[PDB]
Structure 1
Amino acid sequence: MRDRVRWRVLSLPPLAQWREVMAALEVGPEAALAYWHRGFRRKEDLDPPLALLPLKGLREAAALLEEALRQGKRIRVHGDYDADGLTGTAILVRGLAALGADVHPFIPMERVPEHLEASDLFLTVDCGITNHAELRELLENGVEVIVTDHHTPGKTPPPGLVVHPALTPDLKEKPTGAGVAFLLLWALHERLGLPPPLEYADLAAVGTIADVAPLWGWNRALVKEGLARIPASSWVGLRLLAEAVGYTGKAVEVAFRIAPRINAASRLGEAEKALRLLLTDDAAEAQALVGELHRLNARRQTLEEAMLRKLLPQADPEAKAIVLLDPEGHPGVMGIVASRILEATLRPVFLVAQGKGTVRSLAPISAVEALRSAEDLLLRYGGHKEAAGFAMDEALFPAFKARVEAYAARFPDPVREVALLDLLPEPGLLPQVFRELALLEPYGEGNPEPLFLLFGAPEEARRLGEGRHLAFRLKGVRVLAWKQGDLALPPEVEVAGLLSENAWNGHLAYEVQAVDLRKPEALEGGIAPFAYPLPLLEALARARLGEGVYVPEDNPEGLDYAWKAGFRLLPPEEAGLWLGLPPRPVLGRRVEVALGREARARLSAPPVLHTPEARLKALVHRRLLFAYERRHPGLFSEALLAYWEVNR
């Protein structure tokens, strides 16, 4: 919840690589650091090429589609009911229909009989990887089958043509159902000698974001293309839904405003509505359908809020596993209620309603593995490490509870990490830093928005209402935050926050939105320590007592006070106490380091003459000062190595 949150400072890269990214991407050291951690090291990683990924089975499926089209075979597109499944079938349904195909959708074994009666070619989107037995249409009545999906497969690929990323050896890419739908239509356009179907990238991007797929490589390229096309979409329904939610080109708006609206239709039993919104060219009908989705989303929200309100206060504590029963709960909203409970609790969550079950888990507790430990009690079940689902007779709930509660007790408590890119730059460099981080977008599963660490005594603190909302300043920068129940900041605070560009009344303000705030505590990070920060007062005392000490040539003023006081001056490689920094590395040491307060070495504190790699130096300096002051042997030692190098 709060005592199991670990803050860590990301490691510094080798200076030669840091400088290469800076030069190659034309950015300062802060953004360069972020790029490096995300794997962006060439100008080609920021704008990857949107190309036809060579998935296994893709050429064949496209060949089969050409045959279906030319011979006028009846194509049925069977997609999933969430955003990815719906955008994926809309892509294939619109795509194939534009080429003169006789095609129609079918939205979700007892169905196979009519699946047979209605089609010559059966296309599953975002599903069908594990539906073996239904090889019936392949067998029972000669129906051609194409499976496109990306979900966790089975022990063996199902009958029929199967196109799946995970079945493509080597391939690092992780396209989703809509991504695969999109690649397939593209493969077909290639066979027909037609241009890439880029007008379908917006639908594809919506599905990819909705499925929380990693946003790097091809997925990153697909999303930049689709996000950009939404405003003037070829699909009036998508455009109108984007406008209804005030879309401004952000992947985050799709993830939190557009897709949930599409998903609500499904969860509430009206998935046809969302699909039709994506297939219509009639603006009037689309407008009405957006209204309808807004109504379904409001209903889903109302039900989710009521359920959360009934559940969260229950069996939560420090239980190891939260397992609750709500007999009459709506199964269409419980997945999200379990996610929200998991977050306010850092515990796997298991919910059961109307005989249906959903699991959201984290840390070392595999969701599906907990269910496997109680499998005898279940009618159906399955999922992965983070989410899972099942069906079970509610009479068995108490037995199910103990089973999972004990499964979870086998593991150490889940712990949440907060990753910090670096210390926040000085107020004057925030605009440039913000503009350079800009290029990282779109943010998502692939690349999270970076967080900066602020530290100090809060000043000018002032509340906003009677709630936790409040604002203050740290060394000149305004930070906005929701004080976790308490209000009133301690004397000194540590903040993990997002660099924001806040527009108001035609003007901009560069501030920080705190994601976490807390009393200064141990920070994870740094290298195997060799230099240990010691306050100058303590160091001078020991020096006066006769400890073998080192004072660098620089600030002969300090070297004078030393000589002209009889210190047992020594060279850095043999003195276990240093009062300043040596010019070149001195490892295989294990020494205690002091800078000062009125000391000259403490001049990692003076402002530069920006722009070049002068900013690389200033970041290193600010790092040393911070690690020195926090008495953090690991970050100090790491900063000291970077310090030697940016001076060679």
Structure 2
Amino acid sequence: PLALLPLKGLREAAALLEEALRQGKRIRVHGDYDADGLTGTAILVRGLAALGADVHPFIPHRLEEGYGVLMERVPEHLEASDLFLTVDCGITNHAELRELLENGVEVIVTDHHTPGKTPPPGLVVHPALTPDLKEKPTGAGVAFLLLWALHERLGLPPPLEYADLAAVGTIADVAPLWGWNRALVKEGLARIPASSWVGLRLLAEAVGYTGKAVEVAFRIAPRINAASRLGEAEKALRLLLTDDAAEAQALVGELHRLNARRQTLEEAMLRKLLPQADPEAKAIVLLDPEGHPGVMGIVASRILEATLRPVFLVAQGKGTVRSLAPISAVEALRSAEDLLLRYGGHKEAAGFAMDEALFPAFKARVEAYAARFPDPVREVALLDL
């Protein structure tokens, strides 16, 4: 049964929010552009506003600026808020220490992604930093809990009215769905048909939602994620806020387009690139001069799943990477570094930019790099698929 799951930080957070409410502070909710993040952002933005707060959302542009809090827009975050609230990001954006410094903007970091060495500055609400807890809530999950807590003090009923959104974000992030997640999802799914948010009702209707969870995961979530991938996140967020049946359906249709267009672009890129793969290579290094970068990542993962080799795709001047077993995406990019303009990431995934003119040289460098190291087949349980 749904219960306000512990979580080390909620009390302090709720405190800070109520404080903001009374003082009429400007609250900027900085979420992610994926379904979990957008959905979570919606919860806090409506919830707070519902309690007469001064809230406005802020979503990054997946294609121009990356994920998380962007340092370049920090100055802009300052002039716009008194309380900076993070939704599905933050824990590794330590340079928002400038938030607390530069001016006195209180920072509340909500997240669920793998934490770094040290937590980031500010009041943190992360499930992995809660002592003896193994519930695994998602970004939208944490926001829901956060809205719940704020409801506790102030003395208002639990925010069940918001479980649907929270449910969409959870399934979207394919959480275990075995812990408290189950109660949230089950409760959420049930409230979708005729929920309190037209955008979500109409959408659920459009995709013929019956009540199944697979329907949220395979028809609803894709539609919401499709927007950011084509530089149209806002459209998705607005759908989730709006509550104007008119504007709603218009948006539902705009998401239909976006989703279809994303799918067509993946299929198109895939059938152009897959044949060029070839598992005989220590690393797959392909170049689709005219490929939409907002879709390469997906294609890279599928090419990997198919070849069990590191994949390096470059389209326009951008590049993504997906590798496994020995080879590390970033470290591969370490060499050839000179050939790049920028680059960053981790072991399994990484990104970068470069002048396509150096592609041949880059391909040979990365190939040679993976030439060292064993063959990934001597590691994966193949359930890797």
TM-score (norm 2): 0.88
Structure 1, unaligned runs of 5 or more? 1-48, 423-648
What are the Cα deviations for residues 480-527 of structure 1, in whole angstroms up to 9, with x where unaligned?
xxxxxxxxxxxxxxxxxxxxxxxxxxxxxxxxxxxxxxxxxxxxxxxx
Q: Quickly say closer, same or farther: Cα 1:419–1:50, change in 2 above 3 A.
A: farther
Corresponding residue for 1:295? 257
More strand by share: 1
Alpha-carbon distance, 1:96 to partner: 0.4
* Deviation of the 1:166 alpha carbon: 2.5
* SS state at 2:320 partner: strand
- Pick closer, same or farther for the CA change 1:377–1:155 going to 2, 3 Å: farther
In the superposition, relative to structure 1, how do residues 175 and 400 fare at CA in structure 2: closer, same or farther (>3 Å)? Answer: farther
Match of 1:68 among 1, 13, 20: 20
Instruction: State the shift of 1:197 in Å.
Output: 1.3
Task: Provide the rounded CA distance (Å) in 1 between the counterparts of 2:117 and 2:272.
Answer: 40
Q: 1:418 to 1:138 in 2, by over 3 A?
A: closer
Alpha-carbon contact 1:380-1:390 (below 8 Å) kept: yes
Q: Which residue of 2 aligns with 1:481?
A: none
Q: Cα distance 1:339–1:112, how it changes in 2: closer, same or farther (>3 A)?
A: same
SS at match of 2:79: helix
Q: 2:282 aligns with which of 320, 324, 328?
A: 320
Residue in structure 2 matched with residue 349 of structure 1 by the alignment: 311
CA distance, structure 2, for counterparts of residue 167 and residue 393 of structure 1: 42
Contact 1:331 1:356 in 2 (8 A): yes
User: Match of 2:24, SS?
Assistant: coil
Instruction: Summarize deviations over 1:104-153 as a string: whole Å, max 9, x none.
Output: 11111232222112211111111122222232232112111111122233
Pair 1:386–1:175, CA change in 2 (3 A): farther
Unpaired segments of 5 or more residues in structure 2?
61-70
Shift in Å, 1:98: 1.0
1:240 maps to what in 2? 202
- Structure 1 residues 143, 250: closer, same or farther in 2, change over 3 A? same
CA deviation after TM superposition for structure 1 residue 322, in Å: 1.3
Distance 1:333 1:293 in 2: 16
After TM superposition, the structure 1 = structure 2 runs for residues 556-567 of structure 1, keeping only pairs within 5 Å, are none
The structure-2 alpha-carbon separation of the partners of 1:417 and 1:135, relative to structure 1 and needing over 3 Å to count, comes to closer
Assess, with a 3 A threshold, how the Cα gap between structure 1 residues 123 and 228 changes in structure 2: closer, same or farther: same
- Give SS of 2:293's match: coil
1:354, CA displacement in angstroms? 2.4
* Larger CA deviation: 93-102 vs 104-113: 104-113
Query: What RMSD over aligned residues (CA atoms) do the two structures have, in Å?
Result: 2.9
Pairwise CA distance, 1:56: 2.3
Distance between the aligned counterparts of 1:398 and 1:183, measured in 2? 51
Match of 2:337 in 1: 375
Taking a change above 3 Å as real, the CA distance of residues 130 and 343 of structure 1, as seen in their structure-2 partners, is same
1:217-366 correspondence runs (5 A)? 217-363=179-325, 365-366=327-328
2:44–2:144: 8 Å Cα contact kept in structure 1? Answer: yes
Compute the displacement of 1:165 (Å).
2.1
Deviation at 1:347? 2.8
Secondary structure of the residue that 1:95 maps to in structure 2? helix
Distance 1:378 1:152, change over 3 A: farther
CA distance in structure 2 between the aligned counterparts of 1:147 and 1:386, rounded to whole angstroms: 25
Supply the distance in 1 between the matched residues of 2:294 and 2:383 (Cα, whole angstroms): 38
Distance change in 2, residues 1:256/1:377 (3 Å): farther
Residues 92 and 182 in structure 1, CA contact (< 8 A), matched pair in contact too = yes
Could you state the TM-score of these two structures normalised by the residue count of structure 1?
0.54
Contact in 2 for aligned 1:346/1:416 (Cα 8 Å): no
Q: Quick one: distance in 2 between partners of 1:160 and 1:283? A: 38
* Cα pair distance change 1:226/1:300, threshold 3 Å: same
List per-residue Cα deviations over 1:434-454 (Å, max 9, x = no partner): xxxxxxxxxxxxxxxxxxxxx
3-state secondary structure, aligned to 2:131: coil
- Post-superposition offset of 1:304: 1.8
| Residues paired across the two proteins, number | 374
Q: How far apart, CA to CA, are the structure 2 residues paired with 1:237 and 1:383?
A: 35
Partner of 2:4: 52
Cα offset for 1:419? 10
SS in 1 for 2:192: helix
Alpha-carbon distance, 1:332 to partner: 0.5
Q: Following TM superposition, by how much is the alpha carbon of 1:287 offset from its aligned partner in structure 2, in angstroms? A: 0.7
Spell out, residue by residue over 1:18-72, the C-alpha distance to the aligned partner (whole angstroms, 9 max, x if none). Answer: xxxxxxxxxxxxxxxxxxxxxxxxxxxxxxx433232222211111001001211
8 Å contact from structure 1 (residues 359, 388) kept in 2: yes
CA distance in 2, matches of 1:363, 1:254: 32
The structure-2 alpha-carbon separation of the partners of 1:183 and 1:367, relative to structure 1 and needing over 3 Å to count, comes to farther
Describe the shift of the 1:158–1:333 C-alpha distance in structure 2 as closer, same or farther (beyond 3 A). same
Task: Provide closer, same or farther for how the CA distance between residues 396 and 77 of structure 1 changes in structure 2, counting only shifts above 3 A.
Answer: same
Compared CA separation, residues 92 and 363, structure 1 to 2 (3 A):
same
CA distance in 1: counterparts of 2:177 and 2:54, whole angstroms: 34
Name the SS for the 2:277 alignment partner. Answer: coil
Q: Percent identity, aligned pairs only?
A: 100
Instruction: Give the drift of 1:289.
Output: 0.4
SS in 2 for 1:187: helix
* Secondary structure at the counterpart of residue 250 of structure 1: coil
SS of the counterpart of 2:321?
Answer: strand
- Name the residue aligned to 1:77: 29
For 1:400 and 1:77, how far apart are their aligned partners in 2? 40
- Give how far 1:169 is off: 3.2
Instruction: Call closer, same or farther: CA 1:348–1:210 in 2, change over 3 Å.
Output: farther
Q: Secondary structure at the match of 1:254?
A: helix
User: CA distance change for structure 1 residues 231 and 405 in 2, over 3 Å: closer, same or farther?
Assistant: farther
Give deviations 1:574-594, integer Å, cap 9, x for gaps.
Answer: xxxxxxxxxxxxxxxxxxxxx
Instruction: Give the match's secondary structure for 1:232.
Output: coil
Q: Distance in 1 between matches of 2:298 and 2:354?
A: 19
Please say if residues 227 and 233 of structure 2, whose CA atoms lie closer than 8 Å, have aligned partners that are also in contact.
Answer: yes
Question: Offset of 1:77 from its aligned partner?
Answer: 0.8
Tell me how far apart the structure 1 counterparts of residues 380 and 309 of structure 2 sit (CA, whole Å).
17
Inter-CA distance 245–54: structure 2 relative to 1 (3 Å threshold) = same
1:315–1:322 CA contact under 8 A, matched in 2: yes
- The Cα of 1:261 is off from its aligned counterpart by 0.8
| Deviation digits for residues 148-194 of structure 1 (CA, Å, limit 9, x no counterpart) | 12223333222222222222233223222111111111111112222
Deviates more, 1:136-145 or 1:280-289: 136-145
CA-CA distance at 1:271 after TM superposition: 0.9
For residues 310 and 208 of structure 2, the distance between their equivalents in structure 1, rounded to whole angstroms, comes to: 34
Alpha-carbon separation, structure 2, partners of 1:268 and 1:76: 24
Q: Deviations over 1:6-27 (max 9, x none)?
A: xxxxxxxxxxxxxxxxxxxxxx
Answer yes or no: is the 8 Å Cα contact 1:210–1:254 preserved in 2: yes
Q: Which has the larger radius of gyration?
A: 1
Using the TM superposition, give the Cα deviation of residue 288 of structure 1 relative to its aligned residue in structure 2, in angstroms: 0.7
What SS does structure 2 have at the residue aligned with 1:312?
A: helix
Cα gap change, 1:254 to 1:408, in 2 (>3 Å): farther
Give, in angstroms, the shift of residue 408 of structure 1. 4.0
Change (3 A) 1:366 1:204: farther
The structure richer in helix per residue is 2
Aligned equivalents of 2:340, 2:4: Cα separation in 1: 42
When structure 1 is superposed on structure 2, of 204-213 and 378-387 the one drifting more is 378-387
Change beyond 3 A, Cα 1:171–1:386 = farther
Query: In the TM superposition, what is the alpha-carbon distance from 1:272 to its structure 2 partner?
Result: 0.8
Instruction: Report if aligned partners of 2:325, 2:379 keep a CA contact under 8 Å in 1.
Output: no
Distance 1:102 1:211, change over 3 A: same
Q: Aligned in 2, Cα 1:317/1:176: closer, same or farther, shift over 3 Å? A: same
8 A Cα contact 2:277 2:303, kept in partner: no
Q: 1:231 Cα shift?
A: 1.6
Distance 2:42 2:9 in 1: 21
Report the secondary structure of 2:262's partner residue. Answer: helix
Q: Work out whether residues 325 and 380 of structure 2, in 8 Å CA contact, stay in contact via their aligned partners in 1.
A: no
Q: 1:392 to 1:93 in 2, by over 3 A?
A: same
Tell me by how many angstroms 1:305 deviates.
2.2
Question: Deviations for 1:84-112, whole angstroms, at most 9, x for unmatched residues?
Answer: 11001001001101111111111112322
Q: Is this contact kept in 1: 2:36–2:139, CA < 8 A?
A: yes
